Amino acid sequence: LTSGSGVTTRYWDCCKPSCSWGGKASVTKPVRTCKANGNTTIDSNTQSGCNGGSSYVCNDQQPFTQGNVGYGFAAASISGQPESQTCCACYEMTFTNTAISGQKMIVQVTNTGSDLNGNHFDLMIPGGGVGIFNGCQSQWGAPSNGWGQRYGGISSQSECNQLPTSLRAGCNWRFGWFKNADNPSMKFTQVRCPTILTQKSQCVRTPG
């Protein structure tokens, strides 16, 4: 199992995540994707809105809390590891350096980010910036650059009102439990995916 130190980012480009295709890892089902509305299930082979299709990330895949523990979904780039090893794997991380230092978040990986060297987790947070891609204009009518900055997104919890209502929980999570931490570093360890995440994503690594 994988563990180490890493860096994080925040992002929400609305796109169908890479682990939502079949054949990317040994799993029960690929990660669930949705229609434009963010709630009704679309077929896992439907093309992504980011590539001219009609499939998006589900409202269900926003960050949340259980007790004091954070939970969410993320893109990851884990030190030269293929998607067969990362897709729908879960990692629990202890934040190491911001106002959220010491806090614990458990994410399920649903996407592969950019191949930077090392361990990189891009937390999926509504309003945290679209990044390289943006299917949020076609899904929600967001601005061409996303909500706020293309990188980092909005600056204030007041601007969470600019987001679709369906994402406002996740948006707010960034300023409450997450404390609008800016790229918190962490240490992480792979864990068996909790049902509170896998009952949302529907993607369970099945060889065990």
Side-chain angles (χ1 to χ4, degrees), residues 12 17 31-32 57-63 73 110 124 200-201:
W12 190 280
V31 180
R32 183 194 169 237
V57 58
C58 296
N59 291 325
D60 223 351
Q61 277 163 33
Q62 283 183 289
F73 304 84
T110 67
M124 276 171 86
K200 279 156 190 75
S201 70

Side-chain angles (χ1 to χ4, degrees), residues 7-11 73-76 111-114 120-124:
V7 300
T8 63
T9 53
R10 55 189 188 272
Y11 92 103
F73 304 84
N111 188 61
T112 295
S114 286
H120 297 248
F121 277 76
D122 317 318
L123 292 48
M124 276 171 86

Side-chain angles (χ1 to χ4, degrees), residues 139-144 146-159:
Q139 164 168 34
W140 300 110
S144 277
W147 300 290
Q149 307 278 26
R150 175 139 201 140
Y151 289 94
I154 68 178
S155 299
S156 305
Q157 184 276 339
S158 82
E159 297 163 278

Side-chain angles (χ1 to χ4, degrees), residues 3 10 34 69 82 112 146 148 151 169 204:
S3 62
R10 55 189 188 272
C34 286
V69 188
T112 295
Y151 289 94
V204 172

Side-chain angles (χ1 to χ4, degrees), residues 11-19 21-42 44-78 80-115 118-144 146-160:
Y11 92 103
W12 190 280
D13 64 4
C14 296
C15 304
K16 167 191 166 107
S18 75
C19 303
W21 306 91
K24 296 263 195 132
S26 188
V27 291
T28 45
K29 280 162 74 190
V31 180
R32 183 194 169 237
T33 37
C34 286
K35 289 233 316 183
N37 63 25
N39 303 309
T40 84
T41 308
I42 205 166
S44 27
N45 288 143
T46 301
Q47 174 65 76
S48 155
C50 285
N51 304 305
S54 59
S55 166
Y56 298 87
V57 58
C58 296
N59 291 325
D60 223 351
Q61 277 163 33
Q62 283 183 289
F64 60 101
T65 61
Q66 179 145 269
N68 314 115
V69 188
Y71 285 91
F73 304 84
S77 190
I78 297 174
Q81 271 198 11
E83 290 198 316
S84 54
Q85 261 204 79
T86 60
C87 267
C88 307
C90 289
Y91 305 79
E92 107 171 33
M93 44 195 222
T94 304
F95 293 107
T96 278
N97 76 327
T98 64
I100 67 178
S101 188
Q103 302 182 29
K104 285 219 218 131
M105 184 186 190
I106 307 178
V107 299
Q108 187 183 22
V109 172
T110 67
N111 188 61
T112 295
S114 286
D115 194 354
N119 304 316
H120 297 248
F121 277 76
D122 317 318
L123 292 48
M124 276 171 86
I125 311 164
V130 288
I132 285 167
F133 308 94
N134 177 18
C136 290
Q137 176 169 274
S138 100
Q139 164 168 34
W140 300 110
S144 277
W147 300 290
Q149 307 278 26
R150 175 139 201 140
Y151 289 94
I154 68 178
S155 299
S156 305
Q157 184 276 339
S158 82
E159 297 163 278
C160 275

